[PDB]
Amino acid sequence: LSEEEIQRIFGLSLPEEXYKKXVEXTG
Amino acid sequence: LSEEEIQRIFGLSSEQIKSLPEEXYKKXVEXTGYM
Ligand SMILES: [Mg+2]
């Protein structure tokens, strides 16, 4: 999985901004 | 994007999905190519 694919999949520090869009996931 | 889809995409154990944002972050790090 590329960083560009993570942007597309999550609709976007990538790890930090991963964790926050994770939290927004847990609602 | 559901928790179930994220579990499958990143191969997460039943244990890992207890900590989805943290185990997000770690599978984020492995994204960037770091360890
Ligand atoms: Mg937590």
Closest CB to A26: pick one of B21, B25, B31: B21
Residue type, B3: E
CA A19 to chain centroid, in Å, comes to: 7
> Which domain range does residue B7 map to?
3-32
Neighbours of A19 (CB within 10 A): 20
Q: With b meaning 16 or more CB within 10 Å and e meaning fewer, what string describes B1-35?
A: eeeeebbeebebeeebeeebbebbbbbbeebeeee
Burial class (CB in 10 A: 0-12, 13-18, 19+), A22: buried
Cβ contacts of A7 within 8 Å, gap of 6 or more:
none
Say what the resolution is, in angstroms: 1.1
Per the listing, tokens 């847990």 go with A26
Experimental technique for the deposited model: X-ray
Cβ contacts of A15 within 8 Å, gap of 6 or more:
B24, B25, B26, B28, B29, B31, B32
Closest CB to B20: pick one of A1, A14, A22: A22
Note which residues in 1-27 of chain A have CB less than 8 A from chain B. 1, 3, 6, 9-11, 13-23, 25-26
| Number of domains chain A is built from | 1
Per the listing, tokens 């993570």 go with A6
